[PDB]
C-alpha cells in the first residue's frame, strides 16, 4: 500500500523555477561517484581472490618438510604417518635444485624441482595451464624438462630445440670441481600470470636420480590440506614422526602477504567512499534546509488541519530520500555494466595513453578481472541510505518548530 | 603491493 | 448553554527587551449553535485572536476553554487533536495545498485524522456539489477561476463537522457577483449540518447579512 | 568602512541564521574540502614512507647511476675523479659492475659483482659480522658474500667458491669460453634487505673482464628516485648514462604507480565538495532576487556583480585547503606517538610517516582551484538575468 | 528642460506574436517638476521607469535626457547615471536583511566609491531627516510595516538625485502612516530640488500635487 508521509509527497519534488533543473542532475551524479565506483572497487578485490585461489594456491604446495642437509633415507616408511593424519589429503615427494641456465648468456635462475609426474594430479593441479595438447610425455628415459613463459621471454627459444642447464655440483664430501652441463629438450611451455613463470621449472623423479648418482632417495615430502587458514597447526604434529626435528615451512612466510594485502584496501576503500557520500549528504541538507522557508507557506496549512509534531517531522525525513534513492540507484544500474563488462573497458584505455600499466613483472596477475556479487549490492544500498537518513533528520526538526503564528497565515 | 617485508620463519 | 468562555485574555508580546499588550479585556459569549459577526477594524484585534481560540498561539496570561476542555492549558498533541474535528480555518490568503488537485484539498482533513478509505472519498463528494463545485473537482488549484478558489477552501473546513468555524472575511480576494454566495452557503451549513460560525471582517456591511455584531477597540470591546 | 566594494556584500552573507543549526549549513561546503584534503596528505603519507623505506634498504645499498663508456671499460688516466661536473653529485667513487654466475659445492646461485674500494668509505661498513674492510688486497683474490647468498650455497668464513663471468668473454677459435678464477672468502655480511642474496664484495682491480682499469664511475644523488630529469643534461664525452632502471626499473615505478591510483580515488572526495558548490551559491540566487536586481538599481554594473558570489565559493576553498593540510598533517604525525588511533596492525614494527613539504603545496592547490571551476556557472547565471523583469 | 520623451515604442517578445503595449507616449519632464503621473490596471505604471533608469533598453524608441542619450549607451555607463541623478523607490520589500538600517542607506556610497570619511556622516544626516535615528543599527527583520517603508525612501536620497523614480509609496500600508511618508516625500523639493513623480492605483491618495496626468497604454487621458 501507500503511506501518509510517503505516497503524498512524490507531487512536493515537482518543484520548478530558475536554475533548479540543473541541481537535479548535480545532486544525482553527485551521490551516484560513491557508489557506482564502491560497485567496480569491491567486485574487483573479490576478483583478485578468485584468481589467488585458481592461479596461486592450487599450484605450490602448502607443507613442505626437508631434512636437516641429509638425503631422506628413511622415506619410505615416512609417507603412512603423513597419510593417515585427519586434515592431510595427498602427499608427494619433491627434490629441489638450484641451477641456471646457460643457452645465450641470459641472466635467468629457476628452481627445478624433482615433481613425481605419476602423483601430481592427486594434490594439486601442475600441468593444466600448458598449451600443448597433452602432457603424458613425461614418462621415464627422454631426459624432459618443462619451463615457464618467462624464462622462454629471456632465452628466446621455442617448442622443441635444445637448451642447456647448469647442474649442481653433486660431490659426496666439500670439494671444488668443474660445473656439470647437460643439453636437454623442452617439452612445451606454461603460463599462469607472468609472475610464477619465469622462477619455475620441473623435472620428473626418474630422471633427478640419474643427475645426481643416487639411488631411492628424496629431499622434501609435500602435502596437501583440506583447509589452508590453518596451516600453522597440522604441520607441527607430523614433524617428529621420523626424527626430532625438521625444516619446517609453510605458504605464510612466502605467499602469506596476499591475504592480508586484500584485506586491507577493504578496510581503506570501505571508510574512503563514506567520505564520498558524506560529502554528497550534503548536497541534500542543501536542498532541504531551502525547501523549508521557500515552502513556508504550506507547512502552515497543514498545522490548521490537525497534523501533530510527529507528521511534520517525518514529511521531510522521507523527501529528502526520494532524491537519495534515485541518486542512489542510478549508480547501481551503471555499475552492474562496468563492473561485469571491465575486460573491454581495462584494455581500451591501456592502448590509448601509451604504456599499460598492470605488468606481469612483479605484480599478482596480469589482468583486472571483476567477480561481481550480490551481497555487495546490498549492503551499498543500506550505507548509502542510513547517510542520508541523519542529512534529513536535521532539517525536519527545524520545520517541525515552524509556528503558524508567527507566518502569515 | 609497494609494502614488503619478504621475511622467513623456521 | 454556553460553548467558549472568553475571559481577560491578555497577550503580552515580547520584543526585543521590551514588552508590548495588544489584546486587553476582550469579552463575548460564543454559543452553541449561534452564529456571531464581530467586527473589527485597522488596529483592532483580528486574525490573532482566532490564533488564540484555534490554538495556533500561546497566550501569556490567562486560559480560554471550550466545552470544558481548556485550549490554552492543553498539550502539544491534543491540541491538534481538537483542530481536526471540532474546528474550522477559513481565510482569504488562499490556504490550499497547490501540489494535488481540488478533490486532495478538501479530502487533507480526512487523510490526518486516519479515517475510513470508503468514507474519504463520499464525503469529499457530497461537500463539494453542496457549494457549486464537482464540475471541476479533478482540476489544480492553480488554474481555477477568482470565484472557484474560495468556495473550495469552504468544503475544506467542513468535512469534519466543526462546532465552532474559524472564519475571517473570506470576501476580498475574488468577484463581487460571487462574493455573496458564499456568505450565503456558510448560513446553510448552520442549518442543516448546525454548524456555528463566526466571520470577521472590517467593514459593517458584511457584518450586517450575519448575526449581531460585537465592535472592538484594540481588545476592548465597544459594543 | 570596507572601502573594497566587492568584499562588503559577503561578509554579513556567510552565516546569516541566529541558531547554532543554521549557520551550520552555510558552513557545509568548507567542511567537504577540509575532509578531503586531510583524507589525502594522511593516506599519501603512509605511501611515502613506504617509497622512503624501500629507498634506503635497496637503492641505498647498490650503486645508483654508473657513468661507463660506450666502446668497452673507461681509462682511469683519461677521465679522473676531478673532471666530472654533474649535478647532483656529490661523491664520484669507481666500480665494477658485471652480470656473472656463482658456483660452490653444493649449489650454483646467482649473483652481481660489485668491486669496492677497500681505500674508501663503504655504505656496507657496519653490516659486516667481525669483518674488516681493508681485507680486499689485490692478488689474493678475496670475497664477501651475502648471508642470503651464502645460506643456499652453504659457505661458511674461510672456503672456496669460484666466480665465473658468461657476458665478458674472449674470443676462441672453437666456440665461446668463459672466463672463471678462484676466489676465496673471508666472510658474510648481513643488512636484513632484499639485495644481500644477490650481490657481494670484491677488489676493485680484477682481470677476470678484460685487461687494469675500470668500467665507470658511482656516483650518489640527492634524490634517486627521479633519473629522467638528470638524463638529458650536459653529459661528458666518450661515456654513456647507465641508471638503475636497468634492473629495478619495474620495482620503484610500481611504487608511482599505486599512488597515482590512491591520489584518484581519494580525489572523488573533492569532487563532489566542488559540487556543493553549485548546490550552495546556486540556490542562493534563486531566494535571493530582491537583492540582485536591487544592486542594478543602486548603480552597480554587471561586470562587478559577477565576482561577487565568485568569494563566496572561494571562501570555502582557501579556508579549506589551508585548514585540511593542518588537519592531515596531525594525523599523520601524532598517529603512533601515545596511542594508535585508527587500530593495530598484526605485526607492529614501527610503520613510518614521511611528510613531504612539497606535496601539500601541489595537493592544496588543486583544492584552491577545483574550488574556482565550479563557481563560474551561478556566477554567470547571477549576471546573465536581466534587473527588471527580477522585479515587477 | 531635463527630461523629454516622446513616441516611446516598446517591442516585447511575446508568445509567438508582436504587440506593442507602449503606443505613443509622451510627457516632458523639467527640472523639480510637481508631478502626479496616474494610472490605472494596465496602464504602464511598472514599466516605462526601467527605459528612464536604464534598467530596461526599448527597441523601437529612444530617451533623450538634456542632451545624453539613456537608450543610446553601453551597459557600463549606464550604472554610472543610476548612483548619480537617479533614485529608485520601490515597495517589493527590496531591502538586505543581512545589513542594518546605517548600511543600506551607505551601499549606492560605496559603488560610488566614495571616502569612508564622508560616508558615515552623509548617511547619519540622511535618517536624521527622516527620523529613525533609534532604529539606526538595527536589522530590518525586525522592523514594524511603517518603518521600513522609511528606509527605501532614505536610501534614494543620498547622492542626491535629479529624478526619483518612485512606485506606489502607500501600498503596504494603511492610510495611519500614509500622511506621514507624504510630507516626508515633500521635504525633498524644498532642499535639494529633486524631482519625483508619484505613482497611484486609484485617483485619491495622488492629490498632492498639480499636473495630474493620466497616460492609458500610451494613450494620454489627462
Ligand atoms: C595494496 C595497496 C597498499 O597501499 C599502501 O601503500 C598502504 C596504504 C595504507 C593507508 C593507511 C592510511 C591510514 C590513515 C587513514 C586516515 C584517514 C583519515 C580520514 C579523514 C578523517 O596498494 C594500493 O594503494 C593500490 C590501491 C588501489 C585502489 C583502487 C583505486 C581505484 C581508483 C579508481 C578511480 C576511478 C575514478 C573515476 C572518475 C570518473
Ligand atoms: N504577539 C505578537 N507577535 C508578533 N507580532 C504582533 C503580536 N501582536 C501584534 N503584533 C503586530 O501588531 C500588528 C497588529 O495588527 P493586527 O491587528 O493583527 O492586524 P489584523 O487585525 O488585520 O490581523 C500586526 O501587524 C503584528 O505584526
Ligand atoms: N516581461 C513581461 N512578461 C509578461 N507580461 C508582461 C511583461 N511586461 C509587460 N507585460 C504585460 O503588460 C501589461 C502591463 O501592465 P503593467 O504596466 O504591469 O500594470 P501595473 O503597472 O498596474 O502592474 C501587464 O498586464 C503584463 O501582463
Ligand atoms: C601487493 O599486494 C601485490 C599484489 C597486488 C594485488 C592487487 C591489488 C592492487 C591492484 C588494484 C587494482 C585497481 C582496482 C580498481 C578497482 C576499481
Ligand atoms: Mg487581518
Ligand atoms: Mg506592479
Given amino acids: 500500500p501507500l503511506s501518509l508521509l510517503i505516497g503524498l509527497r512524490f507531487s512536493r519534488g515537482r518543484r520548478r523555477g530558475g536554475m533548479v533543473s540543473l541541481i537535479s542532475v548535480i545532486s544525482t551524479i553527485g551521490i551516484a561517484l560513491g557508489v557506482a565506483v564502491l560497485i567496480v572497487g569491491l567486485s574487483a578485490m573479490n576478483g583478485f581472490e578468485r584468481e589467488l585461489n585458481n592461479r596461486i594456491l592450487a599450484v605450490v604446495p602448502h607443507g613442505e618438510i626437508e631434512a636437516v642437509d641429509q638425503p631422506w633415507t628413511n622415506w619410505q616408511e615416512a609417507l603412512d604417518h603423513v597419510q593417515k593424519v ?10 629441489n635444485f638450484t641451477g641456471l641456465v646457460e643457452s645465450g648468456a641470459n641472466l635467468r635462475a629457476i628452481q627445478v624441482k624433482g615433481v613425481n609426474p605419476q602423483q601430481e594430479q592427486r594434490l594439486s593441479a601442475l600441468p593444466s595451464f600448458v598449451q600443448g595438447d597433452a602432457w603424458r610425455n613425461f ?21 622443441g630445440d635444445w637448451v642447456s642447464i647448469m647442474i649442481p655440483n653433486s660431490n659426496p664430501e666439500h670439494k671444488l670441481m668443474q660445473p656439470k652441463r647437460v643439453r636437454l629438450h623442452v617439452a612445451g611451455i606454461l603460463q599462469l600470470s607472468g609472475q610464477l613463470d619465469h622462477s619455475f621449472a620441473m623435472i620428473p623423479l626418474a630422471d633427478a636420480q640419474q643427475y645426481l648418482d643416487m639411488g631411492s632417495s628424496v629431499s622434501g615430502i609435500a602435502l596437501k590440506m583440506t583447509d589452508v587458514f590453518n596451516a600453522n597447526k597440522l604441520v607441527r604434529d607430523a614433524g617428529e614422526v621420523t626424527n626430532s626435528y625438521v625444516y619446517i615451512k609453510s605458504w605464510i612466510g612466502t605467499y602469506g602477504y596476499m591475504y592480508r594485502d586484500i584485506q586491507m584496501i577493504r578496510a581503506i576503500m570501505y ?94 596477475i596480469d589482468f583486472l578481472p571483476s567477480e561481481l556479487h550480490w551481497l555487495d549490492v546490498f549492503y551499498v544500498l543500506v550505507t548509502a541510505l542510513l547517510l542520508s537518513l541523519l542529512a534529513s533528520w536535521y532539517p525536519a526538526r527545524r520545520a517541525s518548530n515552524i509556528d503558524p503564528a508567527r507566518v502569515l497565515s | 603491493c609497494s609494502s614488503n617485508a619478504k621475511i622467513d620463519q623456521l | 448553554k454556553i460553548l467558549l468562555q472568553c475571559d481577560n485574555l491578555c497577550k503580552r508580546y515580547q520584543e526585543g527587551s521590551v514588552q508590548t499588550d495588544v489584546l486587553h479585556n476582550v469579552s463575548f459569549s460564543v454559543g452553541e449553535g449561534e452564529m456571531m459577526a464581530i467586527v473589527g477594524s485597522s488596529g483592532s484585534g483580528k486574525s490573532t485572536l482566532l490564533h488564540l481560540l484555534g490554538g495556533l498561539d500561546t497566550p501569556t496570561s490567562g486560559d480560554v476553554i471550550f466545552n470544558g476542555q481548556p485550549m490554552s492549558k492543553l498539550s502539544s498533541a491534543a491540541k491538534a487533536e481538537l483542530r481536526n474535528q471540532k474546528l474550522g480555518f477559513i481565510y482569504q490568503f488562499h490556504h490550499l495545498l497547490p501540489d ?77 457577483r460571487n462574493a455573496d454566495s458564499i456568505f450565503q452557503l456558510l448560513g446553510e451549513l448552520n442549518r442543516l449540518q448546525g454548524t456555528a460560525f463566526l466571520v470577521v471582517t472590517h467593514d459593517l456591511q458584511l457584518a450586517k447579512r450575519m448575526s449581531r455584531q460585537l465592535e472592538m477597540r484594540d481588545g476592548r470591546l465597544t459594543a | 568602512y570596507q572601502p573594497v566594494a566587492l568584499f562588503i556584500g559577503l561578509r554579513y552573507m556567510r552565516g546569516r541564521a541566529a541558531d547554532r543549526f543554521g549557520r551550520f549549513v552555510s558552513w557545509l561546503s568548507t567542511i567537504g574540502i577540509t575532509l578531503g584534503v586531510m583524507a589525502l596528505v594522511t593516506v599519501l603519507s603512509v605511501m611515502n614512507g613506504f617509497e622512503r623505506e624501500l629507498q634506503n634498504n635497496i637503492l641505498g645499498l647498490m650503486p645508483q647511476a654508473i657513468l661507463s663508456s660506450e ?9 679522473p675523479e676531478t673532471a666530472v661536473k654533474l649535478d647532483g653529485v656529490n661523491r664520484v667513487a669507481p666500480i665494477t659492475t658485471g652480470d656473472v654466475v656463482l658456483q660452490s659445492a653444493r649449489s650454483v646461485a646467482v ?40 645460506s643456499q650455497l652453504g659457505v661458511n668464513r674461510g672456503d672456496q667458491i669460484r666466480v665465473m663471468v658468461p657476458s665478458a668473454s674472449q674470443f676462441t677459435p672453437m666456440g ?84 597515482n591510483m590512491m591520489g584518484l580515488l581519494l580525489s572523488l572526495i573533492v569532487a563532489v565538495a566542488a559540487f556543493n558548490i553549485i548546490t550552495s551559491l546556486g540556490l542562493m540566487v534563486m531566494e535571493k532576487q530582491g537583492e540582485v536586481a536591487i544592486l542594478q538599481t543602486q548603480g552597480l554594473t554587471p561586470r562587478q556583480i559577477m565576482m561577487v558570489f565568485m568569494v563566496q565559493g572561494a571562501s570555502a576553498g582557501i579556508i579549506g585547503a589551508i585548514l585540511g593540510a593542518a588537519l592531515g598533517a596531525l594525523l599523520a604525525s601524532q598517529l603512533n606517538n601515545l596511542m594508535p588511533i585508527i587500530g593495530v596492525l598484526l605485526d607492529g614494527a614501527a610503520l613510518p610517516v614521511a611528510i613531504e613539504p612539497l606535496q601539500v603545496i601541489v595537493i592544496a592547490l588543486v583544492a584552491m582551484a577545483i574550488a574556482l571551476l565550479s563557481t563560474l556557472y551561478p556566477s554567470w547565471r547571477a549576471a546573465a538575468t536581466q534587473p527588471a523583469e527580477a522585479l515587477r
Fill in chain 1, 86 to 95: 585427519p586434515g592431510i589429503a595427498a602427499a608427494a615427494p619433491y627434490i
Fill in chain 1, 139 to 159: 614418462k621415464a628415459g627422454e631426459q624432459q624438462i618443462i619451463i615457464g613463459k618467462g624464462v622462454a621471454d629471456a632465452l628466446k627459444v621455442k617448442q
Fill in chain 1, 271 to 364: 571508510l574512503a567512499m563514506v567520505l564520498v557520500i558524506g560529502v554528497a549528504c550534503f548536497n541534500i541538507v542543501s536542498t532541504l534546509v531551502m525547501a523549508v522557508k521557500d515552502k513556508s507557506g504550506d507547512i502552515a496549512v497543514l498545522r490548521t488541519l490537525g497534523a501533530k509534531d510527529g507528521l511534520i517531522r517525518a514529511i521531510f525525513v522521507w523527501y529528502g530520500l526520494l532524491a537519495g534513492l534515485f541518486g542512489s540507484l542510478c549508480g547501481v544500474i551503471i555499475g552492474v555494466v562496468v563492473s561485469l563488462q571491465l575486460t573491454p573497458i581495462i584494455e581500451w584505455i591501456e592502448k590509448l595513453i601509451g604504456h599499460q600499466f598492470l605488468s606481469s613483472d612483479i605484480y599478482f
Fill in chain 3, 100 to 176: 494535488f488537485t481540488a478533490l486532495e484539498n478538501v479530502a487533507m482533513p480526512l487523510l490526518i485524522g486516519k479515517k475510513k478509505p470508503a468514507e474519504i472519498n463520499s464525503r469529499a463528494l457530497e461537500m463539494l456539489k453542496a457549494v457549486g463545485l464537482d464540475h471541476r473537482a479533478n482540476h489544480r488549484p492553480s488554474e481555477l477561476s477568482g470565484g472557484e478558489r474560495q468556495r473550495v477552501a469552504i468544503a475544506r473546513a467542513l468535512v469534519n463537522n466543526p462546532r465552532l468555524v474559524l472564519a475571517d472575511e473570506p470576501t476580498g480576494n475574488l468577484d463581487a
Fill in chain 4, 71 to 79: 666502446h668497452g671499460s673507461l681509462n682511469p688516466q683519461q677521465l
Fill in chain 4, 111 to 150: 649473483g652481481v659483482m660489485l668491486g669496492i674500494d677497500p681505500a674508501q668509505k663503504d655504505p656496507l661498513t657496519p653490516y659486516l659480522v667481525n669483518v674488516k674492510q681493508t681485507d680486499l688486497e689485490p692478488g689474493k683474490y678475496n670475497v664477501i658474500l651475502g648471508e642470503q647468498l651464502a
Fill in chain 4, 176 to 259: 665461446r669460453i668463459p672466463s672463471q678464477r678462484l676466489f676465496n672468502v673471508i666472510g658474510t655480511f648481513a643488512a636484513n634487505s632484499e639485495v644481500d642474496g644477490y650481490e657481494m664484495l670484491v677488489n676493485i682491480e680484477d682481470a677476470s673482464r678484460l685487461m687494469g682499469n675500470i668500467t665507470g664511475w658511482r656516483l650518489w644523488l640527492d634524490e634517486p628516485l627521479k633519473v629522467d630529469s638528470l638524463s638529458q643534461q650536459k653529459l661528458p664525452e666518450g661515456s654513456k648514462w647507465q641508471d638503475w632502471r636497468d634492473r629495478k626499473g619495474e620495482l620503484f615505478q610500481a611504487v608511482r604507480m599505486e599512488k
